[PDB]
Ligand binder design. Structure first.
Ligand code: R47
Ligand code: CA
Ligand code: CA
Ligand code: CA
Ligand code: ZN
Ligand code: ZN
Length: 159
């Protein structure tokens, strides 16, 4: 019942890069996170560098220009706007976290999967093994899979 994109081609742009990781690793984590959702829907995601993307990926700190101020290290890791124009769809990551490609700090890929879920219109799950469960958990990235509840949720919105 969340808001949905009324198109199946969706662009994203990485507005800026956390210094916690190198650029290529941020690109990879984000690309893989989009792929998780495209794998089970008719949605396709293209990265653009120049132009007007639907989903802007932003790393920012504290009060950063919207109604969802961050809180420094810990607590809220990120937040994202549901489908819509402008700031709609955009996914913001708290730079006061330490973003990583691994089990240390906060795993960017896993957080991005959750965030992109919100960017596509998903709410939270009650399944503790669903990526849309409200609180972060690290799971081995190689064996990561959407739960049946996540797939149900996203397939109910698209396709
Ligand atoms: N509490 C925690 O474990 C970590 C912090 C750990 C730390 O100290 O670094 N924080 C969190 O988990 C916090 C809790 C927020 C709260 O206080 O309610 N959640 C958040 O930060 C939400 C953002 C968020 C959640 C996740 C996540 C969730 C589940 C899993 C997962 C779980 C099980 C299996 C698998 Cl495979 C994956 C992985 C990542 N990744 O990012 C914030 P949001 O939901 O986008 C949101 C909602 C409303 C507003 Br307004 C703004 C943003
Ligand atoms: Ca925080
Ligand atoms: Ca947008
Ligand atoms: Ca950081
Ligand atoms: Zn924000
Ligand atoms: Zn959430």
């Amino acid at each position: 019942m969340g808001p949905v994109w009324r198109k199946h081609y969706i662009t994203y742009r990485i507005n800026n890069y956390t210094p916690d990781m190198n650029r290529e690793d941020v690109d990879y984590a984000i690309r893989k996170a989009f792929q998780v959702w495209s794998n089970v829907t008719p949605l396709k995601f293209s990265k653009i560098n120049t132009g007007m993307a639907d989903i802007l990926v932003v790393f920012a700190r504290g009060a950063h220009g919207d109604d969802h101020a961050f809180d420094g290290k810990g607590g809220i890791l990120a937040h994202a706007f549901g489908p819509g124009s402008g700031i709609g769809g955009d996914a913001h990551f708290d730079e006061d976290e330490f973003w990583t490609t691994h089990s240390g700090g906060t795993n960017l890929f896993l957080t991005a999967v959750h965030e992109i879920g919100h960017s596509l219109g998903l709410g939270h799950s009650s399944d503790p093994k669903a990526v849309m469960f409200p609180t972060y958990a690290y799971v081995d990235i190689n064996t990561f899979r959407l739960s049946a509840d996540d797939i149900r949720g996203i397939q109910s919105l698209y396709g």
